């Protein structure tokens, strides 16, 4: 918990430097997902559409 | 509306419950810490006590380094933000 | 709580006398040589190490209790019986 | 994982608990679709790709951050994850320059 705290600060920087454009909360249920095993390809692939899909819904 | 810095402490409560709650997800324990209330001028008579050398309900003395032991949990705090668990302790 | 506090600041001022309290009881060890002080038990343990600090300095008044009034009990022109009557002006 | 990838449903959609519900079930197909990679681990031929990445967006003191981030990131604790982790943020890399055209007018199509 203390370890889970030092992780996400070092995290932020390369998200934010590389463009990504995910919040804190989101950031964490990535890292969850990882660690319970998932395909890296799927999880691209979800962010990617569900990202395209949310600014038409609004707009 | 207020932004989070004017509107009162609620707001910063609630803010600091959401966050601790995505931190909290990772880490896996028998039961995930949760608050136990204390008010915060209920805070200010505990630590009266300990003071003299008497417990309360947050503190446990520990023969084993004749010291006391506070929660260490996300155990109210006041309003700060588990920032009490560490300065209550010196 | 604070009631509970109020209970004990009296309670204590009793023992001091040696007369037995309200809800610390006294159980004579020999007719009271050392009385053994049997004080509430807690629902607040904070005020439970408080009145337990004070019952030991009645623990030290029952001793000399006894013994000036077991000086009366063994009346004879002696220097305990003039040292433990001086004593009762210091009780 | 049912919780978890609901949650995130909720999340980037910023709205709905239950209105997120074709997203979530789409998700789950998406995911119940079976992906193979083309490579799977190497700390750094993944790290390598992000180097070369930095340099070719024209952000290249960025590029030598990301280094010292890099082995920062081990010393707060070691990942068994980060390919995967290293991979998400690489998709996700966007270019400095220009935008892409408008998606808030390609919604009334």
Known sequence: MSAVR??????????????????????????????????????????????????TLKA | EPYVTEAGREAFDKLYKLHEGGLQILSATTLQPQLVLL??????????????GVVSSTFSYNQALQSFAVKQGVYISGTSPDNVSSLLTQ | ???????????????????????????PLVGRQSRSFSVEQNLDSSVKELVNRILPVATNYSTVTRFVEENSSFEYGQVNHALGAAMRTLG | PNVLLQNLCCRILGKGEADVAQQFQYAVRVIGSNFAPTVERDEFLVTEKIKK?????????????????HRKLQSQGVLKNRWSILYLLLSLSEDPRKQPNKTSSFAAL
């Not at chain 1, 969850?32 to 559409?49: D, F, Y």
């Not at chain 2, 008010?39 to 003299?52: C, G, H, Q, R, Y």
């Not at chain 4, 990445?53 to 981030?69: N, P, W």
């Open chain 1, 6 to 55: 030092e992780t996400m600060d070092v995290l932020l920087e390369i998200s934010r430097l590389l463009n990504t454009g995910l919040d804190m909360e989101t950031l964490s249920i990535c890292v969850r997902l990882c660690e319970q095993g998932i395909n890296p390809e799927a999880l691209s692939s979800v962010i990617k559409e569900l990202r395209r899909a949310s600014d």
């Open chain 2, 39 to 52: 008010e915060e001028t209920d805070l200010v008579k505990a630590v009266l006590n300990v003071l003299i």
């Open chain 3, 1 to 27: 709580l604070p009631s509970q506090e109020t209970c004990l600041v009296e309670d204590l001022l009793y023992i001091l006398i040696g007369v037995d309290g309200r809800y610390i009881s006294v159980q």
């Open chain 4, 53 to 69: 990445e930095f340099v070719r967006q024209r952000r290249e003191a960025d590029g030598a951050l990301f280094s010292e981030l």
